[PDB]
Amino acid sequence: AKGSVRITHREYVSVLSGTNGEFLRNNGTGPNNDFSINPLNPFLFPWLVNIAANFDQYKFNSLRFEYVPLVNTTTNGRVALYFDKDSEDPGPDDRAALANYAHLSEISPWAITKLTVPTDNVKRFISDTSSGDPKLINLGQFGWVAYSGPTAELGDIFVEYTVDLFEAQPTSPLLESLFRESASSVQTRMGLPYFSLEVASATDLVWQARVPGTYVVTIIFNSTVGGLTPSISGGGTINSSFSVSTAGSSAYVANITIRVNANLSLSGLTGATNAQLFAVRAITENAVQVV
């Protein structure tokens, strides 16, 4: 074929972390939706996404996840990587469930292991992992568990792959538009799911970051004066900041380097209703310079 491009690459999935005396599947993230293998999924494929945004279909030829320890040799416990063909089945809750997965790999946190998921031969659609039936669009589900260890960053998980992409299309949006109201509850999202919305009160706005990296965020909302209370309730660094706030109208832009699964908080709000997030991925020299 010759509308067919083929890519081989190794990129960054996520950091595998554990908490002391807990099971902790997928870093405690939960909703086994953003761990579907479509690619397109900027959590699993943060580098492939800029390419796959330009195509309609994908087929993996080889796909392998790799754990490389960040932790030292005296560390106790166990990490585990698993893969289910059903991208929609729920995760493992206990260790007993974890062990029945056909495609499983477990090793002590200071060692290296890897998991080779099996690829089939079918073209599927590159889409949102929320844009229709999971079983039709996703090869399957990926996930990890870390138990009986300490409470720390245990390792880096990489993914190495060879995909075919097919059918060039106009680019899917490589940015995020996340809208909310007040007065309602509707929370329409458009573009990649970089950030998620935890709560939209009238006092506080909290956006949790599902995707590690450096961004430029634009947040805009309706309050009644106040505003200036930005902080990172996780591991991150507001490298550049601009704020402006008056009546029923305020706006915040910033060059955060969020990571793992950190947090973005607008605290001193007062009488807030509508709000919208705009996320794009950038470096740091994309730094805001007006105050």
Q: What is the DSSP letter of 82?
A: E
CB-count exposure of residue 35 (10 Å: 0-12, 13-18, 19+): buried
Interface with a copy of itself, residue 244, by CB under 8 A: yes
Q: Which is nearer to a copy of itself, 60 or 125 (CB)?
A: 125
Q: What is the CA radius of gyration of the chain?
A: 20
Distances (CA, A) of 73 to 5, 22, 24, 105, 205: 42, 21, 21, 19, 41
We find the least distance from the C-beta atom of residue 166 to a copy of itself, in angstroms, to be: 8
Residue 284, interface with a copy of itself (CB under 8 A)?
yes
Whole-number Å distance between alpha carbons of 130 and 128: 5
Q: Does 228 bind a copy of itself (CB under 8 A)?
A: no
Per-residue DSSP letter, 48: T
Least spacing, CB of residue 54 vs Ca ion, in Å: 10
By CB under 8 A, which span of 58-66, 193-201, 213-221, 262-270 interacts with a copy of itself?
Answer: 213-221
Residues numbered 123-142 forming contacts with a copy of itself, rule: CB under 8 A: 125, 127, 131-137
Q: Which residue, 68 or 190, is less far from Ca ion as judged by CB?
A: 190
Positions in 83-142 near Ca ion (CB under 5 A): 84, 86, 89
Q: Are 148 and 78 in contact (CB under 8 A)?
A: yes
DSSP string, 233-256: SSS--EEEEEEEE-SS-EEEEEEE
110 binds a copy of itself (CB under 8 A): yes
In the complex, residue closest to Ca ion by CB: 89
Residues 54-83 that bind a copy of itself (CB under 8 A): 54, 56-57, 70-78, 82
Judged by CB under 8 A, the residue of 64, 104, 162, 206 near a copy of itself is: 104
Token pair listed for 92 = 């493992």
Q: Residue 19 interacts with a copy of itself (CB under 8 A)?
A: no
Q: Which residues bind Ca ion (CB under 5 A)?
A: 56, 84, 86, 89, 169
